[PDB]
């Protein structure tokens, strides 16, 4: 028998940093499912920051605003299920970086939707607006650039 161990929101186990020398801070150690459990729905929590580029962890619960970005972005559903709805914007953001509110109703024809279960990833195309639909709480990783919606709170998610 084989058992592959995936974590979830109602079932995870944070690892450890045993320090022989230096400080645990420098490794910025966190667990997404702990973060996702502890943050408002679709709050974009930065869990990884590389020279501007970011990995955000979003709590997928309910329905999200319309997001849009001038560049490609990616979502991976780490837990549960998210419906990603896509609008082809009539006037896409040409310039800028990071995640952006497409407003309460954007201008675009509906492209359709994608159904992401755990371990499914999905392209969030440049110059579309996208929105998340989760029935029960899930976890989302979004590969993007640090935007106006990115939250940093290292001190409260990281081993210190």
């Amino acid at each position: 028998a084989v058992n592959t161990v995936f974590a979830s929101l109602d079932n995870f186990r944070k690892g450890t940093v045993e320090i022989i020398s230096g400080e645990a801070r420098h490794y910025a150690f966190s667990n997404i499912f702990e973060v996702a459990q502890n943050s408002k729905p679709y709050e974009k929590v930065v869990v990884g920051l590389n020279l501007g580029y970011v990995v955000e962890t979003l709590r997928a619960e309910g329905q999200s605003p319309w997001f849009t970005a001038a560049h490609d972005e990616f979502a991976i559903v780490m837990d549960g299920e998210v419906r990603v709805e896509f609008l082809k914007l009539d006037a896409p953001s040409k310039h800028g970086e990071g995640t952006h509110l497409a407003g309460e109703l954007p201008v675009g024809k509906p492209m359709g939707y994608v159904l992401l279960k755990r371990g499914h990833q999905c392209l969030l195309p440049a110059g579309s607006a996208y929105r998340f639909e989760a029935s029960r709480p899930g976890v989302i990783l979004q590969q993007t650039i640090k935007g106006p919606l990115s939250v940093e709170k290292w001190a409260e998610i990281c081993l210190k």
Partner: protein, 321 residues
């Protein structure tokens, strides 16, 4: 510079600057000159081949790749230093060490040639021990599909039009046999056929037939998602000089982390599913993984970084807090 097949063993031997590279039923041998006389070092075939495989498969990247505590390369860009004993405290102190710089395609081609020759049909340097046979004994065939493995670079995301395939033509790995093979549901609206893209990444990794070899799955400018399937031990102990972020997607991996000079253990890090971790730049690492585990590596592919931790701008670790 490949010799003919040697009479007893059947393996050629190789020249690479002032380095000669040899192998018998048990050991890879590297030879070199210093303070007068010929110097040597032995490495078990199974280790040497695995370490060399990673080196070749990573295009050498940039940073230190250590075979053991005597042999390793420096991966300079278009050049590659191959040292013997240089980054070994007592050996240069002795002055018995030897470095030599090389154009990357030369060393690459040579290592590829050594790998073709010294790897039998029964061995697979990309495999974990339980997956492949032995690397020991005289020459006995070649392993074709280690050789025959085309690599196709991701440009946006796999599954897409003008880019790298999914892996629905690859058997699910024994140790991921419980990982769902279901694909995402895509419901393109009318007049938008083929405009929406999604795949099962865990399905994709479940079918990875290599170990410890990050492959890009998502490009967001420089931001790269390079996941891989990790089992047994990282064949080398390496460390680039960029900051990378590790994200454990399944099972667990123990990471040994030490000062890129002497080796001082600095940390022993255990990541379980969901753990997020920065690997700083002034440290080299090596990981342990009982079960085949799914690891997301997050690289930043901008070109001026590894000459930027050097400059005072950028510290080895990503965040102050």
């Amino acid at each position: 510079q490949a010799s003919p097949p040697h009479a007893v063993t059947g393996y050629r031997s190789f020249q690479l600057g002032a380095f000669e590279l040899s192998r018998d039923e048990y050991f890879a041998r590297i030879t070199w000159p210093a303070k007068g006389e010929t110097r040597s070092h032995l490495i078990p075939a199974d280790i040497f081949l695995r370490a060399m495989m990673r080196d070749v498969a990573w295009g050498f990247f940039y940073g230190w790749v250590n075979f053991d505590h005597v042999i390793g390369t420096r991966n300079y860009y278009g050049k590659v230093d191959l040292y013997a004993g240089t980054f070994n405290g007592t050996l240069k102190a002795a002055g018995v060490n030897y470095t030599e710089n090389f154009e990357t395609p030369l060393i690459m081609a040579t290592f590829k040639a050594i790998l073709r020759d010294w790897t039998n049909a029964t061995f697979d340097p990309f495999a974990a021990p339980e997956e492949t046979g032995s690397a020991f004994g005289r020459k006995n065939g070649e392993n074709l599909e280690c050789i025959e493995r085309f690599r196709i670079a991701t440009k946006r995301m796999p599954g897409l039009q003008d880019d790298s395939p999914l892996r629905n033509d690859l058997p699910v790995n024994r140790q991921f046999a419980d990982v769902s093979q279901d694909e995402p549901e895509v419901h393109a609206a009318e007049g938008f056929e083929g405009e929406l893209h999604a795949f099962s990444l865990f399905k994709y990794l479940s079918r990875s037939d290599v170990t410890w070899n990050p492959s890009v799955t998502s490009v967001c400018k420089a931001s790269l998602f390079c996941p891989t399937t990790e089992e047994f031990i990282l064949p080398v102990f390496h460390g680039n000089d960029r900051v990378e972020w590790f994200i454990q997607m399944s099972d667990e991996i123990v990471w040994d982390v030490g000062d890129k000079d002497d080796g001082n253990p600095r940390a022993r890090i255990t990541m379980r599913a969901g753990d997020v971790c920065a690997m700083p730049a002034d440290i080299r690492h090596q990981g342990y993984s009982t079960k085949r585990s799914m690891l997301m590596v997050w690289e930043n592919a901008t070109p001026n970084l590894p000459h930027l931790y050097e400059s005072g701008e950028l510290k080895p670790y990503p965040i102050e807090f």
